[PDB]
Amino acid sequence: SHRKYEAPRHGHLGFLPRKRAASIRARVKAFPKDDRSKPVALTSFLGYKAGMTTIVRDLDRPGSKFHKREVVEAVTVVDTPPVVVVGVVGYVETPRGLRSLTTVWAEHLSDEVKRRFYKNWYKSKKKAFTKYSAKYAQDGAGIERELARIKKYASVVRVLVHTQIRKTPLAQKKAHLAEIQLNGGSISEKVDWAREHFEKTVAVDSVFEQNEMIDAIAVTKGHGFEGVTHRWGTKKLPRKTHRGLRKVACIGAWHPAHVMWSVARAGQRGYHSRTSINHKIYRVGKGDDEANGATSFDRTKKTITPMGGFVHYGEIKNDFIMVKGCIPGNRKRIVTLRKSLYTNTSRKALEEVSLKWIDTASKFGKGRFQTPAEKHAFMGTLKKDL
Amino acid sequence: SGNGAQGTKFRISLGLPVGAIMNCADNSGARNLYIIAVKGSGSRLNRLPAASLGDMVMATVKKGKPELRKKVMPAIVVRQAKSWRRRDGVFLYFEDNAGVIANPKGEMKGSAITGPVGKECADLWPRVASNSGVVV
Amino acid sequence: MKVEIDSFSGAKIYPGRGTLFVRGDSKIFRFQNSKSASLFKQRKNPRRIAWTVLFRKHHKKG
Amino acid sequence: MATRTQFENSNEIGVFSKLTNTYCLVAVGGSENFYSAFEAELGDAIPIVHTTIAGTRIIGRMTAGNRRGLLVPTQTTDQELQHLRNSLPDSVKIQRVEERLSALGNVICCNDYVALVHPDIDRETEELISDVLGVEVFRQTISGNILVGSYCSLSNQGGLVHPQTSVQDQEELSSLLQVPLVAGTVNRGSSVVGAGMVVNDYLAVTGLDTTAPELSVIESIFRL
RNA sequence: UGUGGCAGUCAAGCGUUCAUAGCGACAUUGCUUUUUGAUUCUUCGAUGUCGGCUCUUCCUAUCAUACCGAAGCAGAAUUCGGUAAGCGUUGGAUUGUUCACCCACUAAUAGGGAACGUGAGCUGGGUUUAGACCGUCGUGAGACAGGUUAGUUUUACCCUACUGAUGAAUGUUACCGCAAUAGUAAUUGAACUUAGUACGAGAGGAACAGUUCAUUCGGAUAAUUGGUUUUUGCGGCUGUCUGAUCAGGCAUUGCCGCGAAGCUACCAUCCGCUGGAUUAUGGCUGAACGCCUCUAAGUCAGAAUCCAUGCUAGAACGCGGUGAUU
Structure with missing residues (x-):
């Protein structure tokens, strides 16, 4: 017999196996294509997702029905502290793919990456990098030898960065060490850029800019063990089914005498790595800039942090990328934001957006006010001080 | 969308599957309409073709004149009562479903439309924009 | 960008928030939340609900 | 002249423009030949917005609205x-x-x-129409058609x-409006005549389906 | 394999002229196991038996989509053929139906397989025991190749398989990686513009590029909107019981109104990429055949095809760099 009503599948067999990720920091599989003429800059940046908010702006799209017209949209504020470089690592190319031949660390690493190298920081004698930071006691001849071995060799040069986690309202105190590749030309210039940026910080006024399309890489919000009707999207069976109605009913045919890899079963849902592409930066805001949530149309001084903070996160007092639409991974997750792999030209990209209004009401309920001064003005005085 | 419909209608919430009995809001004589299909719908296994505001349904008349009953005609849904999202921000919904008897080219069978008329169905269909009373 | 006013509770309505109920005699009702909307659907008189603005204008609070 | 024009292909211009x-007010999504039919026989006479x-x-x-006002x-x-208040001259009053x-x-x-107005519109709006447009407002329906x-x-x-x-309704409305009236069709027999075409003193633009005998009666009753 | 079903071979003629634009008799050669016969080899110390729902994967004898080539093809639409199965083939009335036939929709509503897929998946409407009724047959018990009505549908804790999850040992321990191999996904329409232009006696009436939306699918999130509500959070209400106010108990979450957080929905929102090599075919020089010919040597372009770019896991005995090494 055939299917008797030929219909599409459920799910996608290219996102298999749907298991848990390795770590919570999703790897970047591919950095953008190298261009050996550009000035040296990073290809990705490690931020922390805070949450969403609403944006009123002017859609200016010729030939569209909403031309010159105000639309509301959802964006995610991803918190972004500045990020400090602690080492470089260069890869030579083999007939078995790339291979890291040497890595060079900084002089005096902070207590956020020294805390990354111990599972139990409290018992430990904190003796990481003693005999390595004693290699700067000389003139650096071993370390200049290491950089010469990177200069002579090593087709691509990646830079070990790490976040500044104690500038973040998380309670982790441990920074996520990572590798980010460099696109600037003439790899001597790459490794001299990295040598000049040892222990120096990197802000997102340099990596990302306004209106740019960025990809976003993170680990999905996990949901535990999950049955098949919500994991894949299978129909519920009717009310009359003995032994339940929330299943795939026919697993397989008689022959093949096995369960195929393509049928839908139960297991993990969520906590997978994902990459969502084509997300447009609506804002790049700074930490020392008072009134981050101010707009050229709104002109009222207020930060982007809502009334009573972002829910389960806290208060943005840092840099922030503010990117259109949803992003994989929930709040408080290490989101790696990446430059776009390809030159995009679509007139959905290349659109220059200045915002008009940022929503900063409380997300802890059906919020009503924008700033507490506005609440004190509309509600009036209360049983407190006056 | 479709033939005779002018413009690219933005997607609103599908609120009227096949079987819904909406009010007929023009003075042709039908008291209520009955969806039997939706022009422009899709094909997917065990899924009712749902209409929306601005869509073009095929409709029969259950209450009304004898000349309109027992025959299949087109119609145009002009109120929804399922909350949809205009792009400027608001979610909105009318009180009760409505639609007007038409021909396949979009021309009206009646002369005047009672009740408010959603503006997604006034901009897409021009002839509804002529006979409409309260737009929005 | 216009900040509308609630038809039931007098609160201010920022864009992309609440609902909008066009009634059968074409009067437009703008609701801040589902609280005032689901009190309007119960035909509650706005002057008798003690947290609104039309209450505190009828009983002279302030 | 009587120029036949389509709006993207639509044969009804009165919905899509106000002359x-x-x-002359036009919609934003017009073609080159749609704007050409106005900017040819108007040119630089009246602002086309x-x-x-x-x-x-x-x-x-x-x-x-008319020459004196816009609603x-x-x-x-x-x-x-703000765009309507700017692009139009200061003679017309927008409210x-x-x-x-x-x-x-x-x-x-x-x-x-x-x-003439729909008879369900109220007195507080009737006074505003007679104030802004400066036009004596009556309340009558063409043969039961309320719109x-x-x-x-x-x-x-x-x-x-x-x-x-x-x-009898033609003679009554001719005694009221003090202009001659002739019932006719437009756009190959489409009976929605006030939305099928626009008209003023020096111009009348209709759809591409308006046939030559219909166009003859149009330019006869409008004396162009 | 007769028998269905399908494909060539020749060719009289039909088709305005005209066997071939397309038909294709008379013969004749085959294929298929999606029909039904024949056989009776396996199973009767029982491989649970029709239909539907559900869910995969495969084939192609292609309905649509892509790219081509022909007409009794000007355009438009239609018909046929080729490489093609990457992708999609619906909602219903009646009937237990398979099959059908209508009513719509649609880009189109193609044909099939996997023990006539799928009963320790379900339903049990059908056939098929026992009750019962009717018709005809029978002297009668009873029969039917008939109609109708009521009729217990059992078990997985094993092993494999699949889907997730750990895990010893390769000096210990931690971080950053590489990458074999395996999977891979996007699909189709509409509108504007092109343009009432090309083509046309008229009637009518396109396409390439650009733009905006949508259909189906997929992956994510939850600011907003909607749902949920044991935050029993606040309020209200009835019956009874703590002597009454207050504060409460009980009504197997007592009921009702609102309800954050969490979870969630094409009932919400965002996102879903680009190069190389080819098939059919169209060619370039160019012989074979001192002309000719895309083909033989060589070479240019080319499809929803294939392959990488991208995306998902990562070899738990595939590998590298680096910190510390009592």
């Missing part, structure tokens, strides 16, 4: 109202209209002298009405 004596009304492109049926519905935004009873272009059937806007094209010279209209 008066001192201005690309606008939307309340986010719509049905601005001939949303708004209603917009309640849902018209502030950018659209928003507060009524829950329709959109204005199907109610108000007006010219520089005498206006007198879309079923009666009107100018200062004459007027075209609903094609199934009694001769």
